[PDB]
Write a protein that binds this ligand. Sequence first.
Ligand SMILES: N[C@@H](CCC(=O)N[C@@H](CSC(=S)NCCc1ccccc1)C(=O)NCC(=O)O)C(=O)O
Ligand SMILES: N[C@@H](CCC(=O)N[C@@H](CSC(=S)NCCc1ccccc1)C(=O)NCC(=O)O)C(=O)O
Ligand SMILES: [Ca+2]
Lengths: 241, 241
Amino acid sequence: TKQITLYTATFSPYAHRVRIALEEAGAEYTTYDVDILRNMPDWFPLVNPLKKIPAMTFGGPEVPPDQPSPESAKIAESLAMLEFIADLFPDAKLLPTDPVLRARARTFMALYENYVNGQFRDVWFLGTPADPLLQALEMLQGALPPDGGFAAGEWSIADAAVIPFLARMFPYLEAGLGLYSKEDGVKMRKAMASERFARIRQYVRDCRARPSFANTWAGDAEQVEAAKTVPMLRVGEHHHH
Amino acid sequence: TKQITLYTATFSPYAHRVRIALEEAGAEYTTYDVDILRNMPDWFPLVNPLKKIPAMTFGGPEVPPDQPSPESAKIAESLAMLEFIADLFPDAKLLPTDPVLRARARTFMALYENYVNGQFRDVWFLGTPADPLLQALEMLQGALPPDGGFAAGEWSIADAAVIPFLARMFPYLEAGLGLYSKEDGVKMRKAMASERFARIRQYVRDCRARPSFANTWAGDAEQVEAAKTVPMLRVGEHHHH
Ligand SMILES: N[C@@H](CCC(=O)N[C@@H](CSC(=S)NCCc1ccccc1)C(=O)NCC(=O)O)C(=O)O
Ligand SMILES: N[C@@H](CCC(=O)N[C@@H](CSC(=S)NCCc1ccccc1)C(=O)NCC(=O)O)C(=O)O
Ligand SMILES: [Ca+2]
């Protein structure tokens, strides 16, 4: 198989998505953990001109990750990477075969990206109000099959897309990480433990139980420590509405 | 053989995406145009509970669009619909077969969704400064093959995803529709006419020349009039500095 190199960082939920999918695929791959606390290496724009993590190279000669080759394909954007891995490894069935079930997976990924993800970003990094995030999570939970299972029934890349963010939410809340107020932290912790969110808590447990999560997660406390190194999580800053 | 119904509106670039893809697929389908100036029908949340257009039903008995059946699948989110149409009509080759070229298509869609679409929204609906939108458009332009072609080479759903927005930009600017100032309107019109943006103009021309655009566009002047009906475009209102 043509080589896969993923440029990643422990804190990054977008990178985590692609690590999960690569584990589920059974792929051979290399990871290279960047250090955002130091100057970005001058080679990094060769693998992602937008200066984003994850970055992915595919094919080309086998080279050290810090010496990327011009011959490798440079694949940008985590959701594009998820669909790429699903295309590369059809025997791993990272999407359903049925068109309608595949659409459920794609719909779930779009619902998350369009209505939930920006709320996580704004509540955590800007300290905007928590209620719209809780409303968007309740909407997303309503898209899950009610009786159990994953977004499209069997596990798929839709679950790789979403679990990195939901799995960080619980330990980040408990550690008090984020720019939201104390009041909104209390509200979120009570809501996420309440009966209204029992289905999404089961979904999180089901996704975390898979080896693809265990093998790509540093541990709750270690992930909290990695997130504390993120400059935009301006420590000691909180916003109040 | 299963029925497709698309709930649409002329002004909506998101619905336009799916009309283009259905044309390219050679699908048999029904459209039902909603009227956002009157009360939303009580049946509409049965097809989409987020109150969004487009909405799609698939399968079930043939029924009038205003009497949707519980037996049809209810598909939400325009990009999920595009991928669904590609899956349903494999002989139409609405995505490449090669995995790397497929990833170019997905990347282009993610670049537009994540970095460009929100700039269009800020500038048109809030009147924020135009420079970040021009920067994001230059980035998107840079992702196209420079010597010609569509986003992934051959035409794909990536081009159905992006042309509705780029095609509206030119006539909207010429009509002065959107919350940006005259100064930023002049700036954008000059920029989009300059050699800096020749490649994206070629892209717009190439996408517009296909029958799938012609058969799904009401004409520039008619599309402008339809957009004037949108409340959040606040016709007559402009924000300065
Ligand atoms: N749309 C993109 C988004 C990727 C992204 O935002 N990644 C990083 C942000 S980009 C980043 S960390 N780039 C680092 C560039 C760099 C490389 C090497 C050394 C130093 C810096 C992230 O996880 N932020 C945290 C959050 O939003 O919760 C995608 O889906 O891949
Ligand atoms: N993420 C969604 C976005 C869909 C969306 O925003 N659609 C409409 C907005 S939702 C809409 S128009 N809802 C109408 C609901 C309705 C149905 C029937 C009667 C009355 C109202 C739109 O085109 N807005 C214009 C723009 O953003 O440029 C998608 O990708 O499908
Ligand atoms: Ca439901």
